[PDB]
Design a protein around this ligand. Structure first.
Ligand SMILES: Nc1ncnc2c1ncn2[C@@H]1O[C@H](COP(=O)(O)OP(=O)(O)O)[C@@H](O)[C@H]1O
Ligand SMILES: [Mg+2]
Length: 246
């Protein structure tokens, strides 16, 4: 049973890409066959895993258009994860997909061609609420929102939840919002805690545990492995994701 996890937040700089790669690595160490999908035309995930996006002969762009089979675009990573990479060509997807029926299902259609090949698919969405993020949410079974807790600035959470609700109404009724993964947690003061409590109070959004601290045997890596183990057990036995605050 392939599990597809979308990692989404229209706010940039909240450690989405780091989260995708780090959860991917932790799951791989636990024996899962992991595919990572880069849906950001800027190619941050792709670059971070050792591939120059500008030099890829093809990418997820051609895969979303149906011009290249998904298997043909996959590349390898040093840690064993498989990558469906991105480059700047993907910025053109919007103009080209808008002209076609079912633009929201392009990634879903692509992953269907790979089903059974991976235990876990993790999708790194760009910092936007356009067709690429919609493709990520439409293809996923679960979604988490990496959520910075350095500052109280969270005015985008409301529109993000509206987007989840719209997807559930129209393109993906089975999408489950697992919750927010706190990122950039600062242990120096109680401020990050207070930020998370304010978010938990104001928004219909579970705040998950543990927080990822601002940074193999590092505290950030330990927190990612702890969160990845929580994901595993949720998918294995239906255990509810532990929460930062009830
Ligand atoms: N735990 C952390 N501690 C310190 N810096 C981090 C941490 N996680 C991510 N960063 C940095 O934050 C910046 C944005 O991270 P990134 O994963 O690219 O976020 P996003 O994908 O949401 O834009 C990057 O420079 C990254 O190196
Ligand atoms: Mg990113």
């Amino acid at each position: 049973m392939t599990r597809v996890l979308a990692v989404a937040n229209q706010k940039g700089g909240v450690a989405k890409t780091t989260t995708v790669a780090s959860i991917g690595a932790a799951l791989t160490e636990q024996g899962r066959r992991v595919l990572l999908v880069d849906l950001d035309p800027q190619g941050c995930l792709t670059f971070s895993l050792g591939h120059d996006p500008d030099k890829l002969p093809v990418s997820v762009h051609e895969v979303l258009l149906g011009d290249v089979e998904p298997s043909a675009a996959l590349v390898r990573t040093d840690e064993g994860m498989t990558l469906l990479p991105a480059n700047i060509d993907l910025a053109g997807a919007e103009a080209m997909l808008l002209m076609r029926a079912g633009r929201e299902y392009a990634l879903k259609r692509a992953l269907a061609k790979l089903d059974g090949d991976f235990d876990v698919v993790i999708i790194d969405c760009p910092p936007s609420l356009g067709v690429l993020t919609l493709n990520g949410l439409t293809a996923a079974h679960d979604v988490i929102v990496p959520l910075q807790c350095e500052t109280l600035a969270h005015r985008g959470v409301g529109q993000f939840l509206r987007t989840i609700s719209d997807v559930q109404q129209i393109t993906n009724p089975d999408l489950k919002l697992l919750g927010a993964l706190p990122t950039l947690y600062d242990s120096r003061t109680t401020h990050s805690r207070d930020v998370l409590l304010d978010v938990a109070d104001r928004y219909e959004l579970p705040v998950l545990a543990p927080p990822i601290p601002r940074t193999r045997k590092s505290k950030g890596a330990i927190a990612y492995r702890e969160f990845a183990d929580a994901l595993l057990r949720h998918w294995k036995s239906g255990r509810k994701m532990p929460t930062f605050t009830p």
